[PDB]
Design a protein around this ligand. Structure first.
Ligand SMILES: O=c1ccn([C@@H]2O[C@H](COP(=O)(O)OP(=O)(O)O)[C@@H](O)[C@H]2O)c(=O)[nH]1
Ligand SMILES: [Mn+2]
Length: 489
């Protein structure tokens, strides 16, 4: 009481008083804002006129960080204090993950509710959050980054879900805070988290069912196959019972793959609650804002996740990302045991029941995915009947093909056919025929091109503007370069 103070009385000027380098976002602009700057109510009209049960269990807010911009950190803390019912916030625990300046977190202990923990050494987000979860005294946990901003009644909608079902790991729609001007922008409420075989976050359109349910309830919560960020609410016992976080992961990976697989495969579920909104400052090429991400992944954490939950399906990930096979990922022994103990379901269960919309190749396919040449993708051009095939610039995806065990390159039941084998002859998309020789292809030169079996003809673009892909005599030309997204070879 004598050592604490209300946030309105907090001296933010002095705090911030003692531009991209230090944090990969405009710090100069961050400091211009007041710790309690106002933000737009990005909620759906429906949320506005809604009541929440007063008996919602209080929560402990755990914010973990490593060298964060003071303005951003502070703005996050008061964001919580001001935007949520004081009685639902047992405490705000700040885990200073070994920041160069102890004071960044220290000086905030003066504020009501804020307790701050420090680390002897850099421990990373996974360990720090575990530390926080343990020091927490509430029954429910709320994890947030050191650079977020809570909106109107963001918390109740999340607590409502967990109270109802301890096994629900709920997240708010994550709004965007511009890293250059900190304008607070609203994200969609009609997209789910997903991924491709290279295990990189991807956005998805809602499911038909989900859509109907939205016709009924416009702000209805929706299940999500892949968590989209690091913001979420969860039961403390359930968090521990399920295995907390994989303490052996490192600072780079997407620990989020592992957390999403484990929740789903082990009984729980993941939900996105539209009425809940929390702004987040995304770095340059963050996957949430830049499709495909930056295009670089230090595989450790991705392997750790794949090797523990995907069963035989990890080979697809490895088909899309060979290099990852040669990336060390440490011991996953205790994790495989946690899975054993928890008797979680297999991945095949997950693909079929949680993320069925992810097209999985046939176990006997030789290669699968989009057929790319430079940034262009092989496309039927919508000519699904004895038609000429061509290319469209790929969509970051689009049209998938399969190099089947029988040596065919098909799109459903249509095969690329070598109608005429004289150089320059256009190929055609036709109904696949079991033993038909005009439909047999093989990869050569390290899966960098497609030759027509029993000939010296290769699939070529040269004629694209003259009528479509054709078969030319294999050569150096780059219009003969083709790559499947994943190769099981
Ligand atoms: O306890 C922590 C919290 C954050 N970070 C580092 O701070 C950066 C941003 O963390 P965050 O989880 O917000 O990642 P983002 O969502 O921006 O990609 C990363 O380099 C983290 O690995 C850390 O090392 N330990
Ligand atoms: Mn973040």
């Amino acid at each position: 009481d004598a050592l604490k103070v209300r946030w309105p009385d907090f001296n933010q000027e002095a705090y911030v008083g003692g531009p991209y380098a230090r944090n990969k976002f405009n710090q100069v602009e961050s400091d211009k804002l007041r710790m309690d700057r106002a933000i737009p109510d990005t909620r759906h009209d429906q949320c506005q006129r809604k009541q929440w049960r007063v008996d919602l269990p209080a929560t402990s807010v755990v914010i973990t960080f490593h060298n964060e911009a003071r303005s951003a950190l502070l703005r996050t803390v008061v964001s919580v204090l001001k935007k949520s019912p004081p009685h639902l916030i047992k405490e705000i625990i700040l885990v200073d993950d070994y920041s160069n300046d102890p004071e960044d977190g220290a000086l905030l202990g003066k504020i009501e509710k804020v307790r701050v923990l420090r680390n002897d050494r850099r421990e990373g987000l996974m360990r720090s959050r575990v530390r926080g979860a343990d020091a927490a005294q509430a029954k429910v946990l709320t994890f947030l980054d050191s650079h977020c901003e809570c909106n109107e009644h963001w918390l109740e909608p999340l607590l409502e879900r967990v109270a109802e079902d301890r096994t629900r790991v709920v997240s708010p729609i994550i709004d965007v805070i511009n890293m250059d001007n900190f304008q607070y922008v609203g994200a969609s409420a009609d997209l789910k988290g997903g991924f491709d075989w290279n295990l990189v976050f991807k956005w998805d359109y809602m499911t038909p069912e989900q859509r109907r349910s939205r016709q009924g309830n416009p702000v209805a919560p929706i299940k999500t196959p892949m968590i989209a960020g690091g913001l979420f609410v969860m039961d403390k016992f359930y968090f521990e019972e399920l295995g907390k976080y994989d303490m052996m992961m490192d600072v780079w990976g997407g620990e989020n793959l592992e957390i999403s697989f484990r929740v789903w495969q082990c009984g729980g579920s993941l939900e996105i609650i539209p009425c809940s909104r929390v702004g987040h400052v995304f770095r340059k090429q963050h996957p949430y804002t830049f499709p495909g991400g930056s295009g670089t992944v230090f595989a450790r954490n991705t392997r750790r996740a794949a090797e523990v939950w995907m069963d035989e399906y990890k080979n697809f990930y490895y088909a899309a990302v060979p290099s990852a096979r040669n990336v060390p990922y440490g011991n996953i022994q205790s994790r495989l045991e946690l899975r054993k103990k928890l008797s979680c379901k297999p991945f095949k269960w997950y693909l079929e029941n949680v993320y069925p919309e992810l097209r999985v190749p046939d176990h006997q396919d030789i290669a699968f995915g989009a057929l790319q040449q430079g940034t262009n993708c092989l496309d039927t051009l919508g000519h699904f009947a004895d038609g000429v095939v061509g290319v469209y610039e790929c969509h970051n995806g689009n049209q998938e093909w399969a190099l089947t065990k029988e040596k065919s390159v098909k799109h459903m039941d249509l095969c690329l056919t070598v109608v005429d084998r004289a150089p320059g002859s256009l190929i055609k998309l036709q109904g696949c025929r079991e033993n038909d020789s005009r439909q047999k292809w093989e990869q050569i030169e390290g899966n960098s091109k497609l030759r027509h079996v029993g000939s010296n003809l290769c699939l070529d673009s040269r004629t694209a503007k003259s009528g479509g892909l054709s078969v030319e005599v294999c050569g150096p030309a780059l219009s003969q370069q083709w790559k499947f997204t994943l190769n099981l070879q």
